[PDB]
Fold Plasma retinol-binding protein.
Amino acid sequence: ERDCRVSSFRVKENFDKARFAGTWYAMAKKDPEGLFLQDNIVAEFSVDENGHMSATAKGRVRLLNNWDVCADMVGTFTDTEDPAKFKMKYWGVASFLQKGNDDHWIIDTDYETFAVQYSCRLLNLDGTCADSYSFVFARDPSGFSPEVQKIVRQRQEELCLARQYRLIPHNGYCD
Ligand SMILES: CC1=C(/C=C/C(C)=C/C=C/C(C)=C/CO)C(C)(C)CCC1
């Protein structure tokens, strides 16, 4: 009875890039297939004078040889015909870290407390998603009141992703 087709999902109305700038702490995530950032994750968003949005990000990750390193990453965003939907190109400061190109959607935000992000890397023949990831971000690395926790859960049900996330530690391991 629920529609899980990716083309039917509602996104943030009248999205505002300049208002989204500044520091964002990751507090929970849903993982995709393969290598991915593990914990101690912080993001910094910026917008230039001509309207182009970009970001940096740091976090610990375990490489192919299980070595434990602090990764320093960089991303740039290209606008589309929906103001909340972007294309993101990304890479690292060290040459052995991963590079690529992903969809980046803002499902909802209030700019001053919380944000919900989503990416579908592959579509099924019937229009639902075959490989996805998602981040829950905070301005304040504290818990979220009861009423904001309830709005975050309603957005996780829209995405057909209820009960598939885990909490992330913050440890000092990276700078
Ligand atoms: C750049 C960037 C993002 C994605 C980063 C990812 C996808 C990194 C993967 C790193 C790996 C796998 C390193 C191992 O070689 C997010 C969405 C947080 C928003 C801020 C900018």
Notes: The pocket of retinol is lined by residues 35-37, 43, 55, 57, 61, 71, 73, 75, 90, 97-98 (CB under 6 Å). The CA atoms of residues 70 and 175 lie 8 Å apart. The beta strands are 22-30, 39-47, 53-62, 68-79, 85-92, 100-109, 114-123, 129-138, 166-167.
